[PDB]
Structure 1
Amino acid sequence: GNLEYKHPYLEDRDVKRVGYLVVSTDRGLAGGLNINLFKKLLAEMKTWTDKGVQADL
């Protein structure tokens, strides 16, 4: 649509700082669940941090 009004969440923005919500376990013994998620997060987090884009968790 072209009928869009102004509204932060809907409209884009030039990027300097990015936030991640990470869900993770209260409990162990789940095996290689958490760490195979967290290395993917850190790879992406490193990718932005490569160009100096800030990040938050």
Structure 2
Amino acid sequence: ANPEYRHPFMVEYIVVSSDRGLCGGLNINLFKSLVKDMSGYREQGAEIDL
């Protein structure tokens, strides 16, 4: 309804992990999946903030 203004968030990583033991691969499977996308950003030559 308001085409008069475009917020910067409408035109063109925070990582969650546990604080304790006994995790059945929970954190490892997440870091394994993250490294794939961080490596992809370096093939593109982009800098990364975490």
Unaligned stretches of 5+ residues in structure 1: 13-19
Identity of aligned pairs, percent?
Answer: 54
Which structure's residues are more often helix, by fraction? 2
List 4+ stretches of structure 1 deviating above 4 A.
none
TM-score (norm 2): 0.82
- Superposition RMSD in Å: 1.8
What runs of 5+ residues in structure 2 fail to find an aligned partner?
none
Larger Rg: 2
Structure with the largest fraction of strand: 1
Aligned length: 50
State the TM-score, normalizing by the size of structure 1. Answer: 0.74
